[PDB]
């Protein structure tokens, strides 16, 4: 029914397949290697696995590369192709969540928070953007305003905060390139307090 | 552990400073010749871990007539 994959811009392709032994096969149009991962149930109706193409920060694909991705399922004495896709890696980017969130400095009404990105290709340079949100005491994550950073800025200075107050903070990252490119997962929330 | 004298490369000479393991040496194309672009004059004494003998790496060097 659905075969969806994302490239982390380095050496990992994450695949989900919805619809009993199945796997994803990767066949690149101009590389010597091939890759396979065993699809595992992540729910009752979906399977997933990661294609590992190399070391965490290796650059295994470019915009020129086309990788043929196939879902193969064992049916008795015979294998079958359940889904196929000519994967253009940089058209289907999804990065890892931002990491290493920390408070740079906190005041009574202000707070500067920084983070880093993980396994993001050097090809991006500064062609990246971020979104952040702050969890307030009497509200939930879904109620939190999406803060937009339309440049590669790995920090934010939250203004108009309330003294002596607990907050939580999340940030996600996205490259500007790629038709099907989507946001990274949210980072782990960072908890902090404004000064009294 | 030392390496034997390197094999000769056509139209090139080599003056090894050290025959010991891990040493890096470089072939020099003779007069009237040039290193072909894309080819390397580097060779080094590595270890054949399978046979415990040291040998110079085979260079890709091609010495062509000076254009």
């Amino acid at each position: 029914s659905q075969f969806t994959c994302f490239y982390n811009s380095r050496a990992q392709i994450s695949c989900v397949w919805s619809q009993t032994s199945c796997q994803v096969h990767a066949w690149p149009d101009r590389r010597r290697w091939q890759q396979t991962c065993e699809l595992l149930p992540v729910s009752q109706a979906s399977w997933a696995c990661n294609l590992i193409l190399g070391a965490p920060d290796s650059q295994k694909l470019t915009t020129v590369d086309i990788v043929t991705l196939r879902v193969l399922c064992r049916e008795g004495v015979r294998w079958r192709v359940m889904a196929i896709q000519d994967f253009k890696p940089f058209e289907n980017l999804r990065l890892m969540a931002p990491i290493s969130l920390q408070v740079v400095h906190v005041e009574t009404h202000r707070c500067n928070i920084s983070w880093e990105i993980s396994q993001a290709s050097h090809y991006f340079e500064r062609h990246l953007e971020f979104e952040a949100r702050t969890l307030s005491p009497g509200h939930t994550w879904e109620e939190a305003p999406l803060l937009t950073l339309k440049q590669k800025q790995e920090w934010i200075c939250l203004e108009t905060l309330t003294p002596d107050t607990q907050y939580e903070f999340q940030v996600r990252v996205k490259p500007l390139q790629g038709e099907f490119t989507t946001w990274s997962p949210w980072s782990q929330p960072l908890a902090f307090r404004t000064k009294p | 552990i030392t390496c034997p004298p390197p094999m000769s490369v056509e139209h090139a000479d080599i003056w090894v400073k050290s025959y010991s393991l891990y040493s890096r040496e470089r072939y020099i194309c003779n007069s009237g010749f040039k290193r072909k672009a894309g080819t390397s004059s580097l060779t080094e004494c590595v270890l054949n871990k399978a046979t415990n003998v040291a040998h110079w790496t085979t260079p890709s060097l091609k010495c062509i007539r000076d254009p």
Binding site: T62 | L42, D66
Partner: protein
Amino acid sequence: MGNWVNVISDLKKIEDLIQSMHIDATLYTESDVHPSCKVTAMKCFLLELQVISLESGDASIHDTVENLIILANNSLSSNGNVTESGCKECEELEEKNIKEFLQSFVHIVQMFIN
């Protein structure tokens, strides 16, 4: 732009990687590219880039050089069947260290980008 922009990025990565390395090879380097021979000069840079790869013994160098060449060749194929004439052979170029070679490599790529 496009592919050449990525080529710049790869060139900068190679520059970074080779810092902690000892690659004393001399490379044919066109520091003064004539616009009528720019494609020929580019192909000489691409060829000599392979020497850096071979002499490195480093996997990150291998990947990046291979990536750069893929990207570069993809752009040169799109440039049409424009043949250049009266251009020097790669072996006629001045020989220089990795530092100057990479610097001039960046110089010609910037020219293509602009």
